Symmetry: C3
C-alpha cells in the first residue's frame, strides 16, 4: 500500500516568506478588487442628488436648482467636483464645510416657511439681480428675501421666529456688501447700517463693507451668508437697519449619524450596498479591498496591494516535514476523493483512496484559518473623503497623513500575514502527509519492507480485507 | 514517555481549531476596574461637582463651596454641569482653555485689579441671574457702571510680577436695548480694549433684543489670555467692560484631559483612570472603556484574549500528543513531559525535569514578549470640540477607530497564531523526548507504538535512571 | 568507516532574540533598523532647501532689513528655520494665518519676487516713513518690501491702488495695518481719524479699522503692525483702499507649487550632499524598513520606531529546537565546515574530510534571502513631512497631531519587534528542519548496512571508499552489499 497526496491541473500561484511563485492545488483570494460600477442606495436609503448644484446653491435656492429632486431622508450626498450653480450672486458662505458635514446625512429634512416674504410691509421685497437671471430678467435666491427701501425709507426691519416645528431648524441669512456708497443709498437710504441676528445661543452683529472689488458675474458687490441651528422651542431675532438678506424658509433637520459627500458625475441607480465608492459599490466579506480610497459605508480595509492570495490546498507537484516534494517525490492526479490518501496494489486489483478522516481534519483546519483572517476584521461605518477650506490646508494635510498612515500599516500587515500564513499552510499539509505515513509505518512494523518512496511492500499477502 | 494532563477546563482558540482545552492558560486582556475615581500618579483631580470650568473661573456664586487644589492631574466635570454662565453669554476659545487647565503643576488666584480702586465708577452691579438669597449678585471674580451719571474713560492695568504665567479673563456686556445701555453706561458708542505685548483686541457691545435666557435678553461675552512674566495687561473702556479683579497664576506641566462623570474622588491610587473605575494592570490590552486618562493598555474591541501556556489537555504538527501517544497522564504531576516505567521493582510516574524547565522558560518568555514589548505612554483620549468643530471631532473619531481596529485585528490574530505555535511546541517537545529515548535503547527494546519501549534485557531502577538520564548502554 | 551529518559553526558572537529564547548566538544576522546618519543637511531629491539664517519666514517676506543678505533660490524642497529665530517682525505686531503661510511656502517649484505697486507711484502720499525698530545704521528704516503710507502736506487723500495678476502665476500678496498708540500719533501720521483699510479680490473681502490704544512697549513701541496675506489667482485683481493706517505691499511673490513639504528646525547649514530622507541630525541613506534616528524627518523615510535594535537571524544557532537536530541529537556545529550551512564529515581509509551539501545549503540560502527581502521590500514608503506648526490657540489640534504620531509609533515598534521575535524562531526551526531532513535522507539510503550511533554519524558495516561516500552524498548509494551481514 502506497501513501500519497492530491495533485491537479491548477496553475494558481501564491508566495510565502520563503518561496515566491509556488503552485498550489487550491487558493482563496482575500483581496476584493471588484465593484458593480453603480452609485447605489446605502443601507436602503438613497443619496441626495445635487445634479450640477452645490449645497449652498441648493439651500439658498439658486434659480438654476429649481428642478432638483430633494428627498426627505438621505444617506450620503452626491455632488459634482466643481459643481456649477452655487452662489449665483457672488460672495461667501461662512463655516461652509461644517454645514456640508452637518447635512451629509439626515434622518429627516423638510423646508418650512418661517418668515413669509409679504410680511415685510414697510420694506420693498422684490429686488433681484441679473447675476441670478431667469429668462434674462433679474431674480434672486428663491429661499431668501432682499429687503430694500420702500418709497425712499428703510425703517428698522424686525422679524423673529419661534421654533415650534418639532425639530432643530437650520436657518441661513446674508449680508449685502455694496460696491459703492451710491448703491448703498439707492438701496437702503441709511448709511451706517448693521445686521443683527440672535438666539439663546447666538449673538451676531454684522456691518456691511462698502468697497470696490473685481467684478464676478458682473458685480463688484458681494453677499456673505451665515447659518445657525435653531434649537427646539428657541426663537431667532432678526433686526436690521439695512443690508439684511432675510430667510423666507428654514429646514427642520433631524439626524441621525453623519456621513459624507461623494464627488461624482454619475447618477443613482437602484441597487443596494453597505459600501459605496466613486467607482461603484462593493459587496464583499473580504478583509481588504483596493478598489478606491474614498469609500462611504462599512468597508474592507483599503490596502495598496495588487493581490492577496491565501494558499488552501497543498503544493501541486506534477517542506519543514520532508514528505511533500520530499521522500514522496510527487502527487497523485488519480486521487480525487481528498488531499491525502492510499494507493495499494493488490492481486485483486489496484486503485486510489483518500483517507477521509485526515482530509476532513485538514479541511476543517484550513477552513478555520481562512475564517479567522476574515471574520476578525472589525468593520465600522466611515466616510473618508473630507472637506477643508483654502485656509485649512494643515488640517487637510493632517487628514492625508493619517489616511496614509493606516494605508501603510494595513498594507504591510496584509502582505506579510498572507506571506506567513501561506508557509504555515504548506507546512501543515506536509506535516499531515508525514503523519499519515508514520501512522501506517507504526502498525506494519516488520511485516513490510519500507521502500523509501512512501510505499510499503508487504512480506505477507494482503487482500482487500487486509487493506 | 508521556505528557501532562489535568482537570483544566480552560479553552483557547488557535488559527486552525476553536474551543481547544489546555492544561494551562493566561488571559492577557484586562477587563476589570476598581469602580473608583482615583489620584493619578499621586496627584488628585480637580473636582468641579456641579460646576463648569467657566463658572468656576468666573466666580459663579453657586460655586463658592468648591474644593480647589493648587495642583491636579486631570479635571472631573459632569456631562452638562448646571452652574456655568449664570448670566447668559459665551466664552471665546473655551475649549482651548479647558485643554490648558486640564492639568496643572501650580494654580494660584491673585488679586490684580482691586474692586475698590475703581473710583470714578460704580462697582456694585449685579443681576438676579446670579442671585444669592434672592438678591442680585454677580460673578465673584469679575467686576463697571455709571456713577452720578458719568462713565469716564475707565483704564486699569497690571504688571505680571507674580513670577509665573497668568490666566486673565474679561467680559463684554451686550445689552437688550439702548435704554439699558444709557442707564448703565451713559455713553453710546462704547468699546472695550484689551492689550499686552502680544494681544491686541478691541470690542464693541451688541445692543439688541434676544430670546430670554434666565429672563435676560442681554449677554456676557467672555475672553481670555495668558499674560507673560513681567508683561503688562491694559484695559481701557468707555462702557460695557466686565473687568477681572483676580488673575490665575499657572504653571504647567504636561497637559491632560477632562473626565465626564458623576462620581467623586475616593483616595486610592492608579496610573490609568477610566469613567467607570481605575485599572491596575501589566496586561497589554483592555476593554473597560475607551475614554481613559493615564498610561493605559491598548483599548480593544474584544471579549477575551486567552493565550495557551500549557499543552492541550487530553484526559499536531508533530503527531505525538493526542497522536501516536493517545492520551495524557493525570498521574504525572511533577512536570509537562516525563516517563512511566514498569519494573520488577515497581511502577512509577516521573516528569522529565530538564525538558519541562526548558519549555517553561520558553513559554514564560513568549508571554513576556507579548506583554513587555507593548509601549505605553500618557494619554487623555477624551477630547473637547465646539459645535462649530464637528469635522475636527470627526477626524479624531476616525483616528481612534482606526487604531481601535488595527490593535483589535492584531491582538486577535497574535493570540490565534501564538496558541497553535504553543500547542505545536509542546508537541515537538514530546516527540523529542520520545526520540531521545529511542536513539539510545536501539535494539534492546521493542517499540510498541503507543510511546512505550519494551525491554529485551532486564532494566532495574539503576538502568531506568540511565535511560531518563542520557546515560544507558 | 563512518559518514556524519552536521552543520556550520563560526566565530560569530552576534545575538538575536526569539519569541521563546533570548540572547541566541547565530552564525549570521541582518540588522533591519537604521540608526546612522551623515551629520549633514542636504539637497532633497536634487533640490536645495531654502536657508533662512537667523530669519523667520515673516521677516524674510516682509523684508526685515536684517534679512537683506539671504541667498534665496527660485525653487526649494523644504525650509530651514532656527528654533526661535531673531529677525522676524522688527516692528512689533502680528501675522494672521501665519502657520498656513508657512505650510504653503514650505516647498515651491517656482518663486519669484515681482514689483506690483511701485512706491514712487504713491504721489499725494508720503512714502519714506520708518522706525528705529527696523533700524539700519542707527537710522529709521522699514520692511524692504512694504510701504508705510503717511500724510503728505497735512493731507491723506483716500489711497487707492490695485493690481491685475498678469504675472502668469498665482501670487502671494501681503498687507498690513498700523495700530497707533494714541490719537495724537494717529493724527500726526494720517490726519484722518476714522480710518479703515479695505482689501478685496474675487474671493477676498476684508475691512479693518486701526485699534488705537496704550499697550506695553515693545522695542519701545506701544503701536503694532498687523499683517495679512492672500494668494491672488491668475488674472484676478487685488484692490486696496484706505484713508489711513494701510501698510501696502510694494512687491508680490509669484508662486508655483508643487506638493507641499515642511520646515526643519535646525541650527545647521546646507552642505551639498544628497538624500531622499533628511533629519535634523543628518541625512539617512538606507533601504531598511525601520529607523530610530529622529522622529521629525522630511522625505521618504524608513518607519521611525522606538527600538534600539532589530536584528534578524539569517544563519543558524552558533554552537561550537523544533526538529531536535541542531543542538539536539547532533550536539554541536563544525567550525571545520566552511563551505556551507549543512553537510557531511566522513572518515575513510582514504582520509577524513568536511563537505557542505551544496544543494541544501543553496535552497536554505535562497529561502532566507527571500525572507529578509520580504520584510524589507513590502514596506511602503511615501513622502511625508512630520514636523508641524500650530499657533498658541491651536493646542488641541497639536495634541491631535501628537496623539496620531504617537499612535503610529506604538503600532510600528510593537509590530516590528514582534515580527522579528517571530521570524527568528521560524528561522532557527527552519535550519533545524533542514538538518533533520539531510539526516533522514542519509538514514533511508544506508538502511541496514550501517550502525546509527545516535550522534549524527553512521558507522558502516562494509567498506566505503570515496566513490561510495559520494554515492551517499549524491543520493545514489545502493546498497546491495551486504556485506555485512558477514
Ligand atoms: C436696578 C435697576 O436698574 N433695575 C430696573 C431699572 O431701574 C432703573 C433705575 O436704576 C433708574 O435709576 O431709574 C429707573 C427705575 O426703574 C431705571 O429704569 O428699570 C428697568 C425697567 O423696568 C429694569 O429693567 C429690567 O430688569 C430685569 C433684570 O434686572 C436686572 C437683573 O437682575 O438682571 C437688575 C440689575 O440690578 C441690573 N444691574 C444693573 C447694573 O443695572 C441688571 C442690568 O440692568 C441688566 O441685566 C443689564 O442688561 O438687570 C429684566 O432685564 C427685565 O426684563 C427688565 O425689564 C431694571 O431691572
Amino acid at each position: 500500500i502506497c501513501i500519497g497526496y492530491h495533485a491537479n491541473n491548477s496553475t494558481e500561484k501564491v508566495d510565502t516568506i520563503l518561496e515566491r511563485n509556488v503552485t498550489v492545488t487550491h487558493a482563496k483570494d482575500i483581496l476584493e478588487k471588484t465593484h458593480n460600477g453603480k452609485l447605489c442606495k446605502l443601507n436602503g436609503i438613497p443619496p441626495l442628488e445635487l445634479g450640477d448644484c452645490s449645497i449652498a446653491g441648493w439651500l439658498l435656492g439658486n434659480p438654476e436648482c429649481d428642478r432638483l429632486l430633494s428627498v426627505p431622508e438621505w444617506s450620503y450626498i452626491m455632488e459634482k467636483e466643481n459643481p456649477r450653480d452655487g452662489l449665483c450672486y457672488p460672495g461667501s458662505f461662512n463655516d461652509y464645510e461644517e454645514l456640508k458635514h452637518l447635512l451629509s446625512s439626515v434622518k429627516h429634512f423638510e423646508k418650512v416657511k418661517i418668515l413669509p416674504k409679504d410680511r415685510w410691509t414697510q420694506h420693498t421685497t422684490t429686488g433681484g439681480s441679473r447675476a441670478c437671471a431667469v429668462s434674462g430678467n433679474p431674480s434672486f435666491f428663491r429661499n431668501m428675501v432682499w429687503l430694500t427701501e420702500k418709497g425712499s425709507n428703510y425703517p428698522v426691519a424686525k422679524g423673529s421666529y419661534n421654533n415650534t416645528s418639532g425639530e432643530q431648524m437650520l436657518i441661513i441669512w446674508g449680508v449685502h456688501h455694496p460696491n459703492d456708497e451710491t448703491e448703498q443709498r439707492t438701496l437702503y437710504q441709511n448709511v451706517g447700517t448693521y445686521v443683527s441676528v440672535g438666539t439663546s445661543t447666538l449673538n451676531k452683529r454684522s456691518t456691511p463693507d462698502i468697497a470696490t472689488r473685481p467684478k464676478v458675474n458682473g458685480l463688484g458687490s458681494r453677499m456673505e451668508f451665515s447659518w445657525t441651528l435653531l434649537d427646539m422651542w428657541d426663537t431667532i431675532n432678526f433686526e436690521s437697519t439695512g443690508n439684511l438678506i432675510a430667510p423666507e424658509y428654514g429646514f427642520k433637520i433631524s439626524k441621525r449619524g453623519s456621513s459624507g459627500i461623494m464627488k461624482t458625475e454619475g447618477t443613482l441607480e437602484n441597487c443596494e450596498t453597505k459600501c459605496q465608492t466613486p467607482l461603484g459599490a462593493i459587496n464583499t466579506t473580504l478583509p481588504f479591498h483596493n478598489v478606491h480610497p474614498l469609500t462611504i459605508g462599512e468597508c474592507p480595509k483599503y490596502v495598496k496591494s495588487e493581490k492577496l492570495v491565501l494558499a488552501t490546498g497543498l503544493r501541486n507537484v506534477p517542506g519543514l516535514f520532508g514528505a511533500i516534494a520530499g521522500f514522496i517525490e510527487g502527487g497523485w492526479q488519480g486521487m480525487i476523493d481528498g488531499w491525502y490518501g492510499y494507493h495499494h496494489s493488490n492481486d485483486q486489483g489496484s486503485g486510489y483512496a483518500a483517507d477521509k478522516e485526515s482530509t476532513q481534519k485538514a479541511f476543517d483546519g484550513i477552513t478555520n484559518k481562512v475564517n479567522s483572517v476574515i471574520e476578525k476584521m472589525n468593520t465600522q461605518f466611515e466616510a473618508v473623503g473630507k472637506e477643508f477650506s483654502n485656509l485649512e490646508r494643515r488640517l487637510e494635510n493632517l487628514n492625508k497623513k493619517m489616511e496614509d498612515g493606516f494605508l501603510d500599516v494595513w498594507t504591510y500587515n496584509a502582505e506579510l500575514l498572507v506571506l506567513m500564513e501561506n508557509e504555515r499552510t504548506l507546512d501543515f499539509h506536509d506535516s499531515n502527509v508525514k503523519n499519515l505515513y508514520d501512522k501506517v509505518r507504526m502498525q506494519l512494523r516488520d511485516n513490510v519492507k519500507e521502500l523509501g518512496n512512501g510505499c510499503f511492500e508487504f512480506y505477507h499477502k494482503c487482500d482487500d480485507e487486509c487493506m
